[PDB]
């Protein structure tokens, strides 16, 4: 499970543009294919006034790159959000400096991402990402180059 | 490119049973799918008397797990072998202790593996694997659990 949350998270400050620089998952099948279920590209985070988090992303679905808008509801823990599905799905913010990177996980089993503000490889962010994962039973990891980060569904 | 070879490699001593515990590649497409091109499961290494290396592996091809036998020809460098294809493909042995692990890469762009003798997670081997990769521009990494390592094509 995930025992890394961001202490003192200010959700309003994660607002705006992000790039899914790297992804990792507990199970290969969660990320292997273009259309793999947990292989979603974040576009924008929109905290609500009420402190919920609207997430704009892209998902490759039926041989094309589709826009998806989901809402993750706030909990009593600032760094933990709940998504509505057939399963009780949790979004955990592990760490962020707001201005460059944000690490998060979705768990039921588990997929995590390293988000960055700009379409650049941020070695410092990937370092924190790898450190946060050494805690977790991941079996697949992906990363994207600057050229892919500027394309729909990272093609 | 790969600037990690095993100094003093004794090819006769890599003979026998291996498990593709982890794989990494320069490009997501080389490993993403079951049928991805560089996603081959090593079964056995058979050095020839003449010092060539026969490799027995499995490849998921046309919705099933197929046996494949390839030969990599020795070069003047003990730790480097050449495979016959439309492209000049090179096998480089990075490191081995013969008794537990062997790391190798195939390059044209690049796929590497962490081989182990037994169907167990060897953290020491994965450590050496990650260290060897920090040199290389990998964008996908996979690992297999003991249950998968005992199945045809790691299903």
From Swiss-Prot, chains A, B:
Specify where it is mainly localized: secreted
Gene name for this UniProt entry: LGB
Per UniProt, what does mutating residue 58 to H do?
In variant C; found only in the Jersey breed
Indicate what this protein is called per its UniProt record.
Answer: Beta-lactoglobulin
Keyword field contains Signal: yes
Family the entry assigns = Belongs to the calycin superfamily. Lipocalin family.
Let me know which tissues express this protein, per UniProt: Synthesized in mammary gland and secreted in milk.
Q: A Pfam family in this protein?
A: Lipocalin
What keywords is this UniProt entry annotated with? Allergen, Disulfide bond, Milk protein, Retinol-binding, Secreted, Signal, Transport
UniProt function note: Primary component of whey, it binds retinol and is probably involved in the transport of that molecule.
* Subunit record text: Under physiological conditions beta-lactoglobulin exists as an equilibrium mixture of monomeric and dimeric forms. Interaction with LMBR1L which mediates the endocytosis of LGB has been observed in PubMed:17991420, but not in PubMed:23964685.
């Amino acid at each position: 499970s995930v025992t890394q949350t961001m202490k003192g998270l200010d959700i309003q400050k994660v607002a705006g543009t992000w790039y899914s620089l790297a992804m990792a998952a507990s199970d290969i099948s969660l990320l292997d294919a273009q259309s793999a279920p947990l292989r979603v590209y974040v576009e924008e985070l929109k905290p609500t006034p009420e402190g919920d988090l609207e997430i704009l992303l892209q998902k490759w679905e039926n041989g094309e790159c589709a826009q998806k808008k989901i809402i993750a509801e706030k909990t009593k823990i600032p760094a933990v959000f709940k998504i509505d599905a057939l399963n009780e799905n949790k979004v955990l913010v592990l760490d962020t400096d707001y201005k460059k990177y944000l690490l998060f996980c979705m768990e039921n089993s588990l997929a995590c991402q390293c988000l960055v503000r700009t379409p650049e490889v941020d070695d410092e962010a990937l370092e924190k990402f790898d450190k946060a994962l050494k805690a977790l039973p991941m079996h697949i990891r992906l990363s994207f180059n600057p050229t892919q980060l500027e394309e729909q569904c990272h093609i």
